[PDB]
Amino acid sequence: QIDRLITGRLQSLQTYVTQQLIRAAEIRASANLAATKMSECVLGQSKRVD
Amino acid sequence: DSTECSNLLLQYGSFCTQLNRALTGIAVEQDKNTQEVFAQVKQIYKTPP
């Protein structure tokens, strides 16, 4: 019984961690965009349309 | 179409719920992608004859 419970809970934890990894990657992409926008659009004037 | 199997599956919890949620997220992100790429013009212009 204990083994079966361990397996189930372990699978749940695996799923959660993987979901977190993917979401963190997307957030990092957005943060890189924000940094680029701030550097090229506040510290100077940009000529890139829209 | 197996009631006993559904009863067994109920014991695992919310695994299938997480999966449906994720696939719906992807399915809406796709339409977000196409609108962002194409819907950049406010009006519909037309070339003269």
Swiss-Prot record, chain B:
Domain of life where this protein originates: Viruses
Role, per record: Precursor of the fusion protein processed in the biosynthesis of the S protein and the formation of virus particle. Mediates fusion of the virion and cellular membranes by functioning as a class I viral fusion protein. Contains two viral fusion peptides that are unmasked after cleavage. The S2/S2' cleavage occurs during virus entry at the cell membrane by host TMPRSS2 or during endocytosis by host CSTL.
Full protein name: Spike protein S2
Complete-protein stretch covered: 745 to 793 of 1273
